[PDB]
């Protein structure tokens, strides 16, 4: 759900 995924 967060960035960098």
């Amino acid at each position, epitope marked *: *759900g*967060x*960035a*960098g*995924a």
Partner: antibody
Amino acid sequence: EVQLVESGGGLVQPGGSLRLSCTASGFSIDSYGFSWVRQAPGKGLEHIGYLTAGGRAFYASWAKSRSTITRNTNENTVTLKMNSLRAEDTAVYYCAKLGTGSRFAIWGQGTLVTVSS
Amino acid sequence: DIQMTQSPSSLSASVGDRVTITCRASQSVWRNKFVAWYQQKPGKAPKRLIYAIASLYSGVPSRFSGSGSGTDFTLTISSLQPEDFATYYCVGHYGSENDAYYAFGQGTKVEIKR
């Protein structure tokens, strides 16, 4: 219950390095991304870097050249290393899932690192 | 880099006052959604009150509420109570599919007028 226990910290000579770790209790460190954050005495909060849940570390530009954030899935810890420290790195250091867009948030208790001869 | 700004930096208010604290990010936050509001009192660690712009965490008084979109966000305290004088921080998440950052605002200190 659920906890994030922070350890390390203390005195660092200028040019030296700090090593801080947080041990998760009641959940798995692999499950979430964790930040490191600091607060110099009487100043505001400052982001250092982030280790995604996938295990990739990104850093604030000011911290990238000196900082390494890793995790140990076996011991359930996340760790911050910073080298080449200077006086202005004196601060309370926190590990935290900041919870900006998700319901889970948790912080370590904070520990003081003083950089001085 | 990424930068966030709160207005005002310092606020004097009375109990019962309506309080509004704004926060502007230098670029849109992750999914236009990843902003939280924290409360910090002297000698204490930061406590999170709101997340995902407008969601309140269990146990957080309903007088606190959050709004905004994209680059602009607002913390509202409908009726300031004695336990609410503290410093408030907005905190945003940013990045790409191979990028991830966070930034804090500078903090807004809410003190009691007399």
